[PDB]
Amino acid sequence: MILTEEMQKIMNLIQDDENNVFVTGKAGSGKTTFLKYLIEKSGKNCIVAAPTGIAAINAGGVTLHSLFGIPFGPITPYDRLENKFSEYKVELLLKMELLIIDEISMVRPDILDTIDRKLRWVYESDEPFGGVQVVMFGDLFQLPPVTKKQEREILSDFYDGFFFFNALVFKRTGFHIVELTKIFRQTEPEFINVLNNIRNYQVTSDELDLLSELKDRKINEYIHICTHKADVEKINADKLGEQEIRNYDIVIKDKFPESSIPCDLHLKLRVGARVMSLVNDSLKGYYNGMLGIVTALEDNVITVRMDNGRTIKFERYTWSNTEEIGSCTQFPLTLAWAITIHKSQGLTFDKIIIHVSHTFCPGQLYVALSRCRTLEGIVSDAFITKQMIIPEYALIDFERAYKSEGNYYGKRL
Template sequence: MADNKELELAWEFVNNTNRSIFLTGKAGTGKTTFLHRLKMDCLKRLVVVAPTGVAAINAKGVTIHSFFQMPFGPILPDTDLNASKSFNRKFNKTKIDIIRSMDLLVIDEISMVRADLLDGIDRTLRRFKDRNKVFGGVQVLMIGDLQQLSPVIKESEWHLLKPFYKNGFFFSSHAYQECNAVTIELKHIYRQDNPTFINILNEIRNNVLSEASAAELNKRYIPDFTPEPDAGYISLTTHNNKAEATNITELNKIDGQNRFYQAKVEGKFPEYAYPNNEALELKVGAQVMFVKNDSSPEKRYFNGKIGKVIHLDQDEVIVHCPDDEFSIVTKPEVWENINYTVDKETKAISENKIGSYTQMPLRLAWSITIHKSQGLTFEKAIIDAQGAFAHGQTYVALSRCKSLEGLVLKSKIHSRQIISDANVITFNKNAEANEPDEAVLELSQKNFQLDLIVEMFDFYPFLYPANRILDIYYKNRGSIEGQVETPLLTVKTAITNFLKVSTGFNAQLKELSKTEPLPDISDVIQERFKKAVAYFKDQIETHFVTPLKSFGYTTDNKAIDSDLAKAVDLLEELLAAKLLFFNGLTDGFSSKSFLELRAKSKFFSERQT
């Protein structure tokens, strides 16, 4: 990936800044690969969500609606999300912990996310993180291609949303307008390598199909084309019933015994997210498509590979693909449904498997809808785009193909079939004109590192539990015995002093950074940082740790005891996090070390709730 400067720029922005990012790019530019690399190697605590069940399973994430507990109807900016009668908005402690400790939210297939849904995400994150920051201060990585499939909005829903939004796309949401996201477009195409074909696809993508390109493309118009039985062509069509009818007709033409393969569903796996037919009917001679990448080390097949069934057994299907020397012995594959939890030991966000779906990774594939083909790659395809009815359909269909030679058109492509939304074209033009460069990256890195240092010396979250303990004590003095007031007043005075000192230090840091390089590599800032750490460590020991040693109480009232315990736990948790940072960074500031330490700490504040 190192040869691709846009991918590396995106990697730097995600990992070394806190800017929100819209990562886009034509079909086949490696957006999905980037996401998988991020999940493996990112130091930030991240959660992956997607708008549909199938997209979520493919991205190894969860759906937006289930994670954020969103209602399915329109989400109006001026209504209370929690008042939705049709939806349970009560978040459990685990979910709240995940949101509070989240650094990065990845939204895959962002082109299908409606504006009001993105604003709903913003409101939920603000509720549990920082209510004064867009997305609650969480960095958001939005991945997708606006020239592909767009959000589904019913007429009645748009009637309600129209007063608040210019259009239904995510970029017209209030949160997106506010978040100052950078747009990075991946330009290197891995799927196709023919410059003529790439040029045609670009023209279609940008709604400027020239006569010369249309003529070149329409050379592939072969109206009465009938592929050889073993040629491995798949037909792409606009409507689901067309694709289903073709597959059933073709299957029925084959003499011979059919066999059914029943999916095995374990735990929680919602029906709408099934990645394949629950009862899969196959015959020897059937054309099939693999619907998952091979999980074995041999990597014999990938999602979208076409082949023909040559043998059926109870628990395996043997498939032969054109141009392969070998046949593929296909066994059931497992799709996992995951949810997220916070690990009690490491405090990291971890993925948990809550359900699985086991089935042959195959489906009948004489025909498939353009919609279902999004994200797939085909060697040979017959495209029937005559009924193209939605933005991006023609582009999605054509861009599935690896080459112009592997493409057959059932109907000619005219520019009128290339339905592109004017809002998308305008947005893309503006984004292209403002693509970030190294200078923007460096400034964003500097601001990110300064923000991390500010976070490290921020003692404001300590006020809530300290005040809460005193408040409970003063209201219930008669029911509480022990040393509460004196140690807590000492701590509270110390917090107030720390806030003054850190405000002064932050102002000084901001001034220094105007002329200094990144804090990571600035000798001047490092020197000031080390002095600040030494000062705060000493002060914490004297005015925090020592007085808290004399703190203690007893009460017979269970409710008071529970309230006090909660506040004391939070105070101790925040103190442990601060000491972890101060002890771990005595030799100087490093954003990488800071993120590693933060991933180990449960560093969040409950003052927002």
Template sequence: MENNPELQLAWQFIENTGTHLFLTGKAGTGKTTFLRRLREQSPKRMVVLAPTGIAAINAGGVTIHSFFQLSFAPFVPDTTLNSAQIHYRINKEKRNIIRSMDLLVIDEISMVRADLLDAVDATLRRYRDREKPFGGVQLLMIGDLQQLAPVVKDNEWEMLRHYYETPYFFASRALRETTYMTIELEKVYRQSDTFFLSLLNKIRENKADDEVLNELNKRYQRDFQPPKEEGYIRLTTHNNQAQRINDRELASLPGKAYSFRAEVKDDFPEYSYPADEVLTIKEGAQIM
């Protein structure tokens, strides 16, 4: 970070001002490392949240919904917070955390819908300063708008489109009342191969031409079957695809299947589980 002017600037903004900050940049530019260092070294009292269970675990925080006790119903502006958006009353300990925090960090902000950010604003105003966006707390939003998009069903958007130009977080009414800085990190630390980086960037920007596709297709091995002992991991686009492969591979193993049920402590909602509640394995199963 010492040699990166953008990261230094981001640090100074968080440490020395109350200005909201959107920290962005492609994969491997140091966003997660910045957050980790901030948590370790900043004197500010911060809460770290993320839109999904896995993202929250990666960020070392909890989900937005669980922290603010929000339901998954769309948050419709201009209606009271006594609507379906609030599950149940926030307990005294949580209220004290909300009132005393200096900085609210939201990781993977690209997945956060505008109405969810406004629900956060309404909850913060309820327990802090009613007159200020987000109750006067400083926001650090981290993410990459060219990665995961917000999930919004057609029937939800039919309701929300009357209030928002887009489902993305930056359409939030509360955020539009504020002035926030954007800092884009450009140096990629995760890859040093400049040719490979240029391929990734062209795909990222939807500029993949014949040259890019030819380079990728050169590496395609139509009949490739990874040796079992090599421990290859197959990437899929959807959970149900992964589940089919896992079930098939498990069924092909000889021997007895053993099932283990997860222990759930405290308030850990099912939608935030990082793995299946019941894990079934056999001897020789590949586990990541």
């Protein structure tokens, strides 16, 4: 691992200055690698979180929703929060000196405000975030936070936009913006060039021509990633096959809409199947997004050898729909040869097959291509076109604002 001069300056900033900091940079600029270095070398008590389970594991932490007990759905400044933290969690949050959030680009502003409110409650303080110093890592030109149209309508009454920096807490505090400008994941200068111009919406037809060889390229080592969950399910079912399959049915109890069920209705597995854990269970040593391989199937237990070498015996898990109207019980596992691009953000691969024939988020195409260390390792189902790129001009405005104002956003303290 190489410690660059940019990284050294940021280390010294964080040690000398308690202000919040946004550490940003293009795909594969070493942000998560540097995150882990910062903690190891800092003398501070650090807690690591991320918006998705996979990204959290990649950073060595847990989801924001788990750490802070955050409910699903949009949270307005007038909603009352249930403060039901255990004493271990209160103590952990009080002991914490540095809150580290990775992949900040996918964090909603009301999530950050909920964290602010919950930390101020835990600390019994009026200081933003309870006085904890916050260091955020990510790339706003990758995927934005997941919001449904109805949620955006509710939030639009209080928020001028749907990115983390729109949080109301940044009227009372702010952060420096620093950037890492050396690419490490890729080494080919022309591949990097097209990536960068996709990222900032300034790619030309001629530059995208470099990627013509991706589509239907002639070749279990290749990882599939898809824009759509429906595509993920088809690819996973194909790779699963019909040899030696066991089926495990969900048990639903009372109210539980089918579109709200967090798990598989009919979990179909075989020995050798690539799977992902859906839930966190620190007692059993597994966490949301951890990957492994099924090694045995029984009546009430599924055995999976995790990538980290641990063998785990999974039992069924019970979700609540809330006030407990209905519940559902099922093994917390799902097939995982294919994954969404949203879940892929943060990971690195040598060989990938991307399914981007229909993109619908800013940054989605950019994230998909930038997972791979080399150009030759990408296969595509479709020619790469400018129509796959969706600009978000509110991000141009944001960067223009802080870059012309001393690389700082929000209330100066």
